[PDB]
Design a protein around this ligand. Structure first.
Ligand SMILES: CC(C)(COP(=O)(O)OP(=O)(O)OC[C@H]1O[C@@H](n2cnc3c(N)ncnc32)[C@H](O)[C@@H]1OP(=O)(O)O)[C@@H](O)C(=O)NCCC(=O)NCCS
Ligand SMILES: CC(C)(COP(=O)(O)OP(=O)(O)OC[C@H]1O[C@@H](n2cnc3c(N)ncnc32)[C@H](O)[C@@H]1OP(=O)(O)O)[C@@H](O)C(=O)NCCC(=O)NCCS
Ligand SMILES: CC(C)(COP(=O)(O)OP(=O)(O)OC[C@H]1O[C@@H](n2cnc3c(N)ncnc32)[C@H](O)[C@@H]1OP(=O)(O)O)[C@@H](O)C(=O)NCCC(=O)NCCS
Ligand SMILES: [Mg+2]
Ligand SMILES: [Mg+2]
Ligand SMILES: [Mg+2]
Ligand SMILES: [Mg+2]
Ligand SMILES: [Mg+2]
Ligand SMILES: [Mg+2]
Ligand SMILES: [Mg+2]
Lengths: 113, 113, 113
């Protein structure tokens, strides 16, 4: 069944200023980069919210290790590395990204066995 | 499988003016309160949309009874009371909240047996 | 389990200008129409993202054929026709729509056997 769900909104211009946690692949895909980086930030945050959300009342247990990979058609897929890849070993992650005007968003759903 | 999904956007400043349906726990968690109350409003609305959405072509069958509980780390979890707690007795609710600038949002997924 | 998830944001005023892919039922339901058409556009896009998202690294395989039907209470439900109805034959689609101020959004989750 479902482990958790997360959603995130990111202000693109504010994110652009803040960045001045991403893989080479992400940075490559992004480079108008702010839009793309902001939606990848939202996606990492959605994944975190979905997982951490499943650990209600537990002590918390990262951003670079949640990688949005894109295929040749630009479809997003999450690839995990590091300590979170261990924790979410049997978990399937579904994500979707959007950016419209000044706002990026993402949703993630984690699903296990 | 999945019962339904809901999403909701809430304008924070407009919500702030409108409020001038929340539990003591919610009101406590919220108190900058408008942001927090708006995302809790979005979460209640997402839950309603997910459930009611599963009743296509049926006569409709509440906000205080959909409580966003937070743990010591601020993770959200829905607790139901009242008549909706009866209707959704076997249903697991997954939620996620966000607020960025003037906009709050929430997503809910209901899952049954 | 889950096939995919999609999310979409649509600027309502920009969408209104762009439209100047919808069924008679959708156009009827919509007619302040821009708001309603924008959320239906977001819903079609979310469905596409959820399905196409499940085809990572595959060659892509439409908008009129993803119909948001509403019941007498305005609950949304997707009805498929055409080539996508074939491709998604065994797939259950869950959707939710929202529009607040200048922004519409939608989320879709596809679920199979
Ligand atoms: O705006 P943000 O994207 O920061 O989202 C904030 C929301 O994330 C949720 N959240 C906070 N910590 C969380 C965690 N560890 N896991 C999942 N969700 C969380 C809360 O609902 C919070 O809103 P609140 O503080 O009004 O409850
Ligand atoms: O903007 P809101 O958050 O009010 O969302 C409105 C959408 O909720 C959806 N909705 C309306 N009633 C609903 C219900 N009872 N259950 C689930 N979703 C519903 C509709 O898609 C509506 O948009 P439309 O009127 O353009 O179809
Ligand atoms: O803003 P949009 O609604 O156009 O969403 C764009 C996102 O959709 C996603 N996307 C693009 N093509 C896609 C497809 N065929 N299926 C699913 N998602 C897709 C991408 O993550 C893209 O953002 P990026 O270009 O920053 O990676
Ligand atoms: Mg956030
Ligand atoms: Mg975009
Ligand atoms: Mg805005
Ligand atoms: Mg609403
Ligand atoms: Mg916030
Ligand atoms: Mg879009
Ligand atoms: Mg609306």
């Amino acid at each position: 069944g479902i482990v958790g769900v997360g959603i995130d909104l990111v202000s693109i211009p504010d994110f652009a200023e803040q960045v001045d946690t991403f893989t080479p692949g992400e940075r490559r895909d992004a480079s108008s980069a702010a839009r793309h980086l902001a939606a990848r930030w939202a996606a990492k945050e959605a994944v975190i919210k979905a997982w951490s959300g499943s650990r209600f009342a537990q002590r918390p247990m990262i951003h670079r290790d949640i990688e949005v990979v894109t295929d040749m058609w630009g479809r997003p897929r999450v690839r995990l590395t590091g300590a979170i890849a261990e924790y979410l070993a049997d978990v399937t992650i579904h994500v979707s990204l959007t950016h419209e005007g000044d706002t990026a968003a993402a949703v993630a759903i984690l699903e296990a066995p």
